[PDB]
């Protein structure tokens, strides 16, 4: 076939696309997360949005994935969380179904990433001491 390059699908246009295609529009969703009865319906909502964004940023940063949108980690994928093979994950399923599937193991994975990052920082400090 013939192509003319990539296209822009919008803020959440890649929601229905597969994970492989949806991972090519991560910045599109990322950059839209920050931006007298009506006037006070704005201040606290803006504060809440700021706190949510900062919670996400801190959570990424304490894993060593700061300033990155795709980040590899040293935590092995315990197969108990999910048994699906990659072939049926990245090419025949969207991210919404993935979030539906793995909703139970989120916090333990987050803690594992946190402790792995702490171990990595300590190991780096030890290595640079020599």
């Amino acid at each position: 076939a013939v192509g003319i390059g990539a296209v822009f699908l919008g803020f959440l246009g890649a929601a229905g696309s597969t994970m492989g295609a949806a991972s090519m529009t991560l910045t599109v969703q990322a950059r839209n997360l920050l931006s007298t009865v009506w006037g006070i319906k704005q201040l606290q909502a803006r504060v809440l949005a700021v706190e949510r964004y900062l919670r996400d940023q801190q959570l990424l940063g304490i894993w060593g994935c700061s300033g990155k949108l795709i980040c590899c980690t040293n935590v092995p994928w315990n197969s108990s969380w999910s048994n699906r093979n990659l072939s049926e994950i990245w090419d025949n399923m969207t991210w919404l179904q993935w979030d539906k599937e793995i909703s139970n193991y989120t916090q333990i994975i987050y803690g594992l990433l946190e402790e792995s990052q702490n171990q990595q920082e300590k190991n780096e400090q030890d290595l640079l001491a020599l």
Partner: nanobody
Framework: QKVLVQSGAEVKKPGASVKVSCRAF????????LHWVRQAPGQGLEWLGW????????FTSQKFQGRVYMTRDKSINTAFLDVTRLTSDDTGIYYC???????????????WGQGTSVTVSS
Amino acid sequence: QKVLVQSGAEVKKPGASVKVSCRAFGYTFTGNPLHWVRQAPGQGLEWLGWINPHSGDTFTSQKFQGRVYMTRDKSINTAFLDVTRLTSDDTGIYYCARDKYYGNEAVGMDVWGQGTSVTVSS
């Protein structure tokens, strides 16, 4: 919901310039490329080319380069085809069609405009 609407029919003298518009509804204008095709009275479909509304890149058929131009405006979700040096052989219905464009490559034209009839005579 996916619809394409063009301007009205055009009658022009030979050697003039004609501008055919095409506005999109029901889908993200920058999310798909737009083919420009033409069908002469009682003949087949001739592929003029296609444009990418997002990056603005265009491709014209080798037997049309330097004669037909394509542009878009995203503020109103419209694509313009400018055909210059009109002749009696350019008569027919111009169609603007949305490509399916799965996998960042041409797959098929599924949504078509109502077709703009352009006529050229002395």
